[PDB]
mmCIF file of all heavy atoms in Angstrom:
data_model
loop_
_atom_site.group_PDB
_atom_site.id
_atom_site.type_symbol
_atom_site.label_atom_id
_atom_site.label_comp_id
_atom_site.label_asym_id
_atom_site.label_seq_id
_atom_site.Cartn_x
_atom_site.Cartn_y
_atom_site.Cartn_z
ATOM 1 N N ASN F 107 131.623 -101.829 60.125
ATOM 2 C CA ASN F 107 132.906 -101.556 59.430
ATOM 3 C C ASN F 107 133.499 -102.872 58.910
ATOM 4 O O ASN F 107 134.593 -102.849 58.347
ATOM 5 C CB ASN F 107 133.826 -100.751 60.346
ATOM 6 C CG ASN F 107 133.368 -99.316 60.488
ATOM 7 O OD1 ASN F 107 132.880 -98.718 59.535
ATOM 8 N ND2 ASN F 107 133.509 -98.758 61.676
ATOM 9 N N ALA F 108 132.771 -103.966 59.079
ATOM 10 C CA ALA F 108 133.239 -105.270 58.579
ATOM 11 C C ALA F 108 133.422 -105.200 57.066
ATOM 12 O O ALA F 108 132.501 -104.769 56.371
ATOM 13 C CB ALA F 108 132.260 -106.340 58.957
ATOM 14 N N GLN F 109 134.588 -105.619 56.598
ATOM 15 C CA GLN F 109 134.851 -105.651 55.141
ATOM 16 C C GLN F 109 134.950 -107.111 54.685
ATOM 17 O O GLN F 109 135.620 -107.897 55.357
ATOM 18 C CB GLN F 109 136.097 -104.837 54.801
ATOM 19 C CG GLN F 109 135.869 -103.332 54.812
ATOM 20 C CD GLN F 109 137.126 -102.564 54.484
ATOM 21 O OE1 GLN F 109 137.816 -102.057 55.365
ATOM 22 N NE2 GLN F 109 137.438 -102.475 53.203
ATOM 23 N N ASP F 110 134.280 -107.436 53.582
ATOM 24 C CA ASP F 110 134.268 -108.818 53.048
ATOM 25 C C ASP F 110 135.512 -109.073 52.193
ATOM 26 O O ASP F 110 136.351 -108.181 52.102
ATOM 27 C CB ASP F 110 132.971 -109.109 52.285
ATOM 28 C CG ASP F 110 132.763 -108.298 51.017
ATOM 29 O OD1 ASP F 110 133.710 -107.629 50.572
ATOM 30 O OD2 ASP F 110 131.644 -108.350 50.482
ATOM 31 N N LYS F 111 135.572 -110.238 51.553
ATOM 32 C CA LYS F 111 136.765 -110.645 50.772
ATOM 33 C C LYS F 111 136.895 -109.815 49.501
ATOM 34 O O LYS F 111 137.871 -110.015 48.784
ATOM 35 C CB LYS F 111 136.683 -112.139 50.469
ATOM 36 C CG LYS F 111 137.554 -113.024 51.347
ATOM 37 C CD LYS F 111 136.853 -113.491 52.597
ATOM 38 C CE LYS F 111 137.182 -114.923 52.953
ATOM 39 N NZ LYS F 111 137.278 -115.108 54.419
ATOM 40 N N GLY F 113 136.526 -106.417 49.915
ATOM 41 C CA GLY F 113 136.777 -105.095 50.518
ATOM 42 C C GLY F 113 135.513 -104.293 50.732
ATOM 43 O O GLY F 113 135.626 -103.100 51.007
ATOM 44 N N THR F 115 131.828 -103.067 52.494
ATOM 45 C CA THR F 115 131.050 -102.933 53.741
ATOM 46 C C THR F 115 129.566 -102.985 53.371
ATOM 47 O O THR F 115 129.254 -102.821 52.190
ATOM 48 C CB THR F 115 131.320 -101.577 54.395
ATOM 49 O OG1 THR F 115 130.867 -100.555 53.510
ATOM 50 C CG2 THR F 115 132.782 -101.362 54.714
ATOM 51 N N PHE F 117 127.487 -100.750 53.775
ATOM 52 C CA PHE F 117 127.184 -99.453 53.126
ATOM 53 C C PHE F 117 127.533 -99.539 51.641
ATOM 54 O O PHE F 117 126.709 -99.161 50.805
ATOM 55 C CB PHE F 117 127.954 -98.310 53.786
ATOM 56 C CG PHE F 117 127.847 -96.985 53.079
ATOM 57 C CD1 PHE F 117 126.771 -96.146 53.309
ATOM 58 C CD2 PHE F 117 128.822 -96.579 52.184
ATOM 59 C CE1 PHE F 117 126.673 -94.929 52.657
ATOM 60 C CE2 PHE F 117 128.723 -95.360 51.534
ATOM 61 C CZ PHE F 117 127.649 -94.538 51.772
ATOM 62 N N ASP F 118 128.744 -99.997 51.340
ATOM 63 C CA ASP F 118 129.166 -100.140 49.928
ATOM 64 C C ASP F 118 128.112 -100.980 49.206
ATOM 65 O O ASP F 118 127.657 -100.559 48.137
ATOM 66 C CB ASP F 118 130.564 -100.752 49.822
ATOM 67 C CG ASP F 118 131.654 -99.975 50.533
ATOM 68 O OD1 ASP F 118 131.679 -98.750 50.387
ATOM 69 O OD2 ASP F 118 132.470 -100.612 51.220
ATOM 70 N N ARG I 23 138.658 -91.994 60.920
ATOM 71 C CA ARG I 23 137.336 -92.410 60.393
ATOM 72 C C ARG I 23 136.260 -91.423 60.854
ATOM 73 O O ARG I 23 135.407 -91.078 60.043
ATOM 74 C CB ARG I 23 137.016 -93.838 60.829
ATOM 75 C CG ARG I 23 135.750 -94.403 60.205
ATOM 76 C CD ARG I 23 135.254 -95.603 60.981
ATOM 77 N NE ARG I 23 136.116 -96.760 60.805
ATOM 78 C CZ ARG I 23 136.164 -97.487 59.699
ATOM 79 N NH1 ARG I 23 135.397 -97.167 58.672
ATOM 80 N NH2 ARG I 23 136.970 -98.529 59.624
ATOM 81 N N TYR I 46 142.299 -104.756 58.164
ATOM 82 C CA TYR I 46 142.193 -104.847 56.714
ATOM 83 C C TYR I 46 143.299 -104.078 55.965
ATOM 84 O O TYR I 46 143.174 -103.871 54.763
ATOM 85 C CB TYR I 46 140.831 -104.324 56.238
ATOM 86 C CG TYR I 46 139.653 -104.974 56.933
ATOM 87 C CD1 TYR I 46 138.821 -104.239 57.764
ATOM 88 C CD2 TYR I 46 139.358 -106.316 56.736
ATOM 89 C CE1 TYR I 46 137.723 -104.822 58.381
ATOM 90 C CE2 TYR I 46 138.286 -106.918 57.376
ATOM 91 C CZ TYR I 46 137.447 -106.157 58.171
ATOM 92 O OH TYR I 46 136.377 -106.740 58.804
ATOM 93 N N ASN I 48 143.876 -100.932 56.272
ATOM 94 C CA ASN I 48 143.560 -99.506 56.114
ATOM 95 C C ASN I 48 144.466 -98.717 57.024
ATOM 96 O O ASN I 48 144.635 -99.090 58.177
ATOM 97 C CB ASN I 48 142.148 -99.182 56.542
ATOM 98 C CG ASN I 48 141.121 -99.768 55.648
ATOM 99 O OD1 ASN I 48 141.170 -99.555 54.453
ATOM 100 N ND2 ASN I 48 140.167 -100.519 56.207
ATOM 101 N N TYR I 56 138.229 -92.365 52.516
ATOM 102 C CA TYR I 56 136.959 -93.055 52.287
ATOM 103 C C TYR I 56 135.783 -92.281 52.939
ATOM 104 O O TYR I 56 134.749 -92.089 52.297
ATOM 105 C CB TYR I 56 137.037 -94.499 52.823
ATOM 106 C CG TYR I 56 135.746 -95.283 52.717
ATOM 107 C CD1 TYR I 56 135.395 -95.930 51.538
ATOM 108 C CD2 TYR I 56 134.910 -95.434 53.815
ATOM 109 C CE1 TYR I 56 134.218 -96.658 51.440
ATOM 110 C CE2 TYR I 56 133.736 -96.168 53.732
ATOM 111 C CZ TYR I 56 133.396 -96.780 52.543
ATOM 112 O OH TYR I 56 132.258 -97.535 52.492
ATOM 113 N N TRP I 79 143.302 -105.428 49.838
ATOM 114 C CA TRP I 79 142.918 -105.652 48.465
ATOM 115 C C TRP I 79 143.691 -104.770 47.466
ATOM 116 O O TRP I 79 143.238 -104.613 46.355
ATOM 117 C CB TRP I 79 141.381 -105.514 48.293
ATOM 118 C CG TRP I 79 140.615 -106.301 49.329
ATOM 119 C CD1 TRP I 79 140.253 -107.617 49.255
ATOM 120 C CD2 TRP I 79 140.273 -105.867 50.652
ATOM 121 N NE1 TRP I 79 139.674 -108.014 50.435
ATOM 122 C CE2 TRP I 79 139.672 -106.959 51.310
ATOM 123 C CE3 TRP I 79 140.429 -104.664 51.356
ATOM 124 C CZ2 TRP I 79 139.223 -106.876 52.629
ATOM 125 C CZ3 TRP I 79 139.973 -104.585 52.653
ATOM 126 C CH2 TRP I 79 139.372 -105.676 53.274
ATOM 127 N N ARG I 81 144.095 -101.613 47.334
ATOM 128 C CA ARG I 81 143.505 -100.275 47.109
ATOM 129 C C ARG I 81 144.256 -99.215 47.910
ATOM 130 O O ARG I 81 144.543 -99.458 49.078
ATOM 131 C CB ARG I 81 142.010 -100.293 47.423
ATOM 132 C CG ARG I 81 141.242 -101.347 46.642
ATOM 133 C CD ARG I 81 139.796 -101.476 47.065
ATOM 134 N NE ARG I 81 139.636 -101.720 48.487
ATOM 135 C CZ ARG I 81 138.462 -101.773 49.097
ATOM 136 N NH1 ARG I 81 137.354 -101.600 48.401
ATOM 137 N NH2 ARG I 81 138.397 -101.997 50.395
ATOM 138 N N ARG I 90 134.048 -93.326 46.654
ATOM 139 C CA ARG I 90 133.030 -92.545 47.335
ATOM 140 C C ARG I 90 132.696 -91.202 46.672
ATOM 141 O O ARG I 90 131.870 -90.463 47.201
ATOM 142 C CB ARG I 90 133.413 -92.350 48.800
ATOM 143 C CG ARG I 90 133.289 -93.612 49.644
ATOM 144 C CD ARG I 90 131.861 -94.108 49.784
ATOM 145 N NE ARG I 90 130.943 -93.070 50.261
ATOM 146 C CZ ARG I 90 129.900 -92.613 49.568
ATOM 147 N NH1 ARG I 90 129.613 -93.117 48.374
ATOM 148 N NH2 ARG I 90 129.120 -91.668 50.078
ATOM 149 N N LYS I 111 143.702 -105.366 43.708
ATOM 150 C CA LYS I 111 143.595 -106.810 43.569
ATOM 151 C C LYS I 111 142.638 -107.230 42.444
ATOM 152 O O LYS I 111 142.754 -108.325 41.920
ATOM 153 C CB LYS I 111 143.105 -107.424 44.887
ATOM 154 C CG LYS I 111 143.909 -108.644 45.291
ATOM 155 C CD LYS I 111 143.258 -109.380 46.444
ATOM 156 C CE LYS I 111 142.141 -110.269 45.973
ATOM 157 N NZ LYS I 111 141.664 -111.140 47.072
ATOM 158 N N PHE I 112 141.677 -106.385 42.108
ATOM 159 C CA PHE I 112 140.703 -106.668 41.061
ATOM 160 C C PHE I 112 141.090 -106.061 39.687
ATOM 161 O O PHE I 112 140.285 -106.084 38.755
ATOM 162 C CB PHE I 112 139.290 -106.197 41.493
ATOM 163 C CG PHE I 112 138.964 -106.463 42.946
ATOM 164 C CD1 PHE I 112 139.076 -105.460 43.893
ATOM 165 C CD2 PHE I 112 138.612 -107.731 43.374
ATOM 166 C CE1 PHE I 112 138.821 -105.718 45.233
ATOM 167 C CE2 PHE I 112 138.336 -107.979 44.716
ATOM 168 C CZ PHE I 112 138.449 -106.973 45.632
#
Side-chain angles (χ1 to χ4, degrees):
Chain F
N107 287 323
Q109 283 179 260
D110 65 11
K111 258 90 141 143
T115 63
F117 172 84
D118 302 315
Chain I
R23 187 198 289 286
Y46 307 114
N48 292 306
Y56 176 84
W79 311 273
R81 304 173 305 175
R90 288 295 307 118
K111 226 191 81 171
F112 320 99

